[PDB]
Amino acid sequence: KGKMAIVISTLNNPWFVVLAETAKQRAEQLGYEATIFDSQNDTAKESAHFDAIIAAGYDAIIFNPTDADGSIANVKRAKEAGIPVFCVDRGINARGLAVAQIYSDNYYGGVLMGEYFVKFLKEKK
């Protein structure tokens, strides 16, 4: 019982659509209400959404920040409001504000592709 705000940086590409609909669906599977807020790649629109989200008394924010610097103020305002923030895919350049920042291991994947690059092309030559 409670509600989560799914704050997505944009919906102009299928990657972010998948993130947003999946978080909303999972929140509802776990007994929460959830709503998607599209920032349309605009930190001012993101901030306005945070205003609405705080005013509406949401219990948690699932956050895909528009800007790793520009979005800190917004997470700071959620923190001051008492609303925990969980970042997904993109993060913020501040520590101790969001509870967690979840992202894909880009360096590790680079190591995996370098290995196969050499193997594949060594075979083909």
Partner: protein, 161 residues
């Protein structure tokens, strides 16, 4: 091949994933001196920019045998540019696991590998951890990397089942 020339499409130069992916790749490839990166250029993680850059690359360095791309959108643009030039011989490698690259790999086009991310799992994890938090949990790492997997012609059926 005593020398094997290749090109690299970087992502947006100002974005750290460009460099985590590129530096991960080069931390391996550079220890094999037969591989010579003959062209390196940003295509801004963008499909249509990758077409235009690859087009310029192919008329400048036709000796390349492979193109490594910092993401799949860029690999898709490079493929369309290769086919337009007739350069169907060039092996293209990407990153993300985008459906369009997955389909290109399984149908035997010149894109031959990518790195699978799991965005549904990370979106669900943020929700699952919020749930745990609202239920009382306060012990969470702040920086949470989620792992990835290599996708090849040889294991593609694991990713299309």
């Amino acid at each position: 091949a005593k020398e094997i020339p290749y090109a690299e499409l970087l992502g947006i130069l100002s974005a750290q994933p460009t460099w985590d992916r590129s530096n991960g790749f080069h931390s391996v490839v550079d220890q094999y001196p037969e591989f010579k990166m003959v062209a390196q250029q940003s295509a801004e993680f963008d499909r249509d920019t990758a077409y235009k850059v690859t087009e310029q690359i192919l008329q400048a360095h036709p000796e390349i045998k492979a193109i490594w791309c910092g993401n799949d959108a860029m690999a898709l643009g490079a493929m369309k540019a290769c086919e337009a030039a007739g350069r169907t011989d060039i092996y293209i490698f990407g990153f993300d696991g985008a459906e369009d690259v997955i389909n290109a790999i399984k149908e035997g086009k010149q894109i031959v590998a990518t790195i699978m991310q799991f965005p549904k799992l990370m979106a669900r994890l943020a929700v699952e951890w919020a749930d745990q938090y609202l239920r009382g949990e306060r012990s969470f790492p702040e920086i949470v990397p989620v792992t990835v997997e290599l996708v090849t012609r040889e294991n593609i059926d694991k990713y299309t089942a």
